[PDB]
A paper describes a structure:
The ethylene-forming enzyme (EFE) is an Fe(II), 2-oxoglutarate (2OG), and l-arginine (l-Arg)-dependent oxygenase that either forms ethylene and three CO2/bicarbonate from 2OG or couples the decarboxylation of 2OG to C5 hydroxylation of l-Arg. l-Arg binds with C5 toward the metal center, causing 2OG to change from monodentate to chelate metal interaction and OD1 to OD2 switch of D191 metal coordination. The best characterized EFE is that from the Pseudomonas savastanoi (formerly Pseudomonas syringae) pv phaseolicola strain PK2, for which several crystal structures have been reported. This enzyme binds mononuclear Fe(II) using three side chains (H189, D191, and H268) with three water molecules completing the six-coordinate geometry. Here, we extend our understanding of EFE catalysis by carrying out biochemical, structural, and computational studies of the enzyme in complex with a substrate analogue and using two enzyme variants. In combination, the results presented here are compatible with the currently proposed enzyme mechanism,4−8 emphasize the necessity for OD2 of D191 to coordinate the metal, and highlight the importance of the second coordination sphere and longer range interactions in promoting EFE activity.
Author numbering: 3 to 350
The structure:
Amino acid sequence: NLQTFELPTEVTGCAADISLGRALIQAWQKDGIFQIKTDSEQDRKTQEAMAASKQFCKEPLTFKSSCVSDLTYSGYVASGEEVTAGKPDFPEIFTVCKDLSVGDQRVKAGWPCHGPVPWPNNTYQKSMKTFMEELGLAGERLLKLTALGFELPINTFTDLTRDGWHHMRVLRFPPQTSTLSRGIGAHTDYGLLVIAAQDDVGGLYIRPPVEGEKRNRNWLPGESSAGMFEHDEPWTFVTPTPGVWTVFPGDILQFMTGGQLLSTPHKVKLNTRERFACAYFHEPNFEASAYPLFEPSANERIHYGEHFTNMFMRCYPDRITTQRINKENRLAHLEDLKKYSDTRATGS
Ligand SMILES: N=C(N)NOCC[C@H](N)C(=O)O
Ligand SMILES: O=C(O)CCC(=O)C(=O)O
Ligand SMILES: [Mn+2]
């Protein structure tokens, strides 16, 4: 039985906010996840996004597959196209990253992963953008509360999320039709927070913290978390519950907290019916470097955009986006922009 919290609309640092942050941390440390109650507008926007997803997925495959870009990873992923731990995953997905036109300087400069969302239509665009703006408000509340719970300055995490690389995976899992029940293999997500919504069908499992269990640092190429613990208990079923979003930490929170919080491993099983879900990623700015909060002498850093780019290249080795990154050596640009960017997102 997960804990469910109502968040205040604004987080100011009062005693109630600090107390709530303590409780959020404790729930992550015990269960790996908690639920936040949605209000009528949060719920309406969730349901409108789910409905737009259902209508898009009914479109012909050739049309859905045309919603792709060789500049951004935004757009369609066919069932069986994504790889997790060397094995295909079976949802169809529409990924929404920051929507930047070719008029944006970062796109003109050829920054990896920067480009315009290949929206299927302008009603889908509006529904997803409205939903993601509401999700972002919740992400910022959660980050202020988490800072307060760790006795950190309230803006510790939000200072990294200005123009943050927030993105969302809009998912449809097919019903199980073969002997394979794997929807998505075990993995961890990459940023600060994951805020997710699901329909009534069910299929998400999460792994709580386990005393003494070593957790891979998925930001390191030699410690991918993909596939880890896939067939080992414990796995907690996330029971579909009306009127909530779930929240769990991503890789950046594990790193910054030195493992006081863990990036929650999770996986999806196919069910007897198709299943719609949306997973939202509240992320640092592409140019931000995460750092250990509790070890100021530690020199390790995570360049968030580098982590995102590495992850999406491993997910989609043959996608046109990945091919163009390799063909234009855009990973080298990524090293260049670390030192010669003009955006002012970081540095003097
Ligand atoms: N893309 C995200 N956030 N999740 O998808 C599943 C994990 C991904 N294929 C991986 O190998 O990490
Ligand atoms: O299907 C879900 O509920 C979550 C999916 C997920 O974790 C992801 O797409 O990364
Ligand atoms: Mn995930």
